[PDB]
Write a protein that binds this ligand. Structure first.
Ligand code: OTA
Ligand code: CL
Length: 298
């Protein structure tokens, strides 16, 4: 693979920092003036992480339509994502309003609520079936229906109801719980096993809205997951691993949201995950059971 030969070169020359810095220097720079308006200051988790104006998700509210969230539209791969920060205590209603209005059926969460003693994300979903959450500002109700706890990730079945219309939808919550902030997953196997659970759920089928992916800021771990997912989808559509330029795909994604992938090692993990995932795409299905065993779900 042209991609695994390049990987060997970068490793042998120790160029991951240099390669990653090159991507930071070439990355798009678009205005974020809605995100920077004074009235939106308390809707942003990080002052240095904002959505571009041209690709931000607008809430269908006449009052204030701003949420820190971006629509990544990968034209060639024919897949879209919504990347967003971990909701704040005052934006959990906005978050589920976005999920409703964009018709998403899956939420991919790559962080924990508390990491390194800090609250990196609000508790925006219910932890107990009998303690549903009501978001008064956006008139939404959220109920935990069931959850499937594995050793390093949890899948939750949620019911989201629009209280104005009494319409309900099932939302699937894919929660990767062992991915450290500014770090990498334990192995390509762990990551690819989790990715398969997401893809196999149907959450990314095109009759639904785009899947929501978030970490704490919605750029680092979110960017790593989304880069690997898009690259694998591309080589799956083509059945040609050598036709995929990972760095070019990352630069394309960064046209829609800043800072996707936050460390050089996350970039390196992206290569490893795509290289390993190519095995399943090119016709070795047994590697999926290998990944499940290697991930130690139990
Ligand atoms: O959650 C992630 O994977 C991620 O990108 N996090 C990021 S990105 C980012 C910060 C954080 C953080 O969580 O502290 C702090 C301020 N600058 C950029
Ligand atoms: Cl928080």
């Amino acid at each position: 693979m042209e991609m695994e030969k390049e990987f060997e070169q970068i490793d042998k020359s120790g160029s991951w920092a240099a390669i990653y810095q090159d991507i930071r220097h070439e990355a798009s720079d678009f205005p974020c003036r809605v995100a920077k308006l004074p009235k939106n200051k308390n809707r942003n988790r990080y002052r240095d992480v904002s959505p571009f104006d041209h690709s931000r998700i607008k809430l269908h509210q006449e009052d204030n339509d701003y949420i820190n969230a971006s629509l990544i539209k990968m034209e060639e791969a024919q897949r879209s994502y919504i990347l967003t920060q971990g909701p704040l205590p005052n934006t959990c209603g906005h978050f589920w309003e976005m999920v409703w209005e964009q018709k998403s059926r899956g939420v991919v969460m790559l962080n924990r609520v508390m990491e390194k003693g800090s609250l990196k994300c609000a508790q925006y979903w219910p932890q107990k079936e009998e303690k549903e959450m009501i978001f008064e500002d956006t008139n939404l109700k959220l109920t935990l229906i069931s959850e499937d706890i594995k050793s390093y990730y949890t899948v939750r079945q949620l019911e989201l109801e629009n209280l104005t219309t009494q319409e309900t939808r099932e939302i699937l919550h894919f929660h990767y719980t062992t991915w450290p902030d500014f770090g990498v997953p334990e192995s390509p196997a762990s990551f690819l096993n989790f990715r398969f659970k997401v893809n196999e759920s149907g959450s990314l089928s095109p009759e639904h809205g785009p899947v929501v992916v978030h970490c704490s800021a919605g750029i680092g771990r979110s960017g790593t997951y989304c880069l690997a997912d898009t690259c694998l989808l591309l080589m799956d559509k083509r059945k040609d691993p050598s036709s995929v330029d990972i760095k070019k795909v990352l630069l394309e994604m960064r046209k829609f949201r800043m800072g996707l992938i936050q460390t050089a090692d996350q970039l390196r993990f992206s290569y490893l995950a795509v290289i390993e995932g190519a095995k399943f795409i090119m016709g070795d299905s047994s590697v999926q059971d290998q990944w499940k065993e290697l991930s130690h779900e139990d």
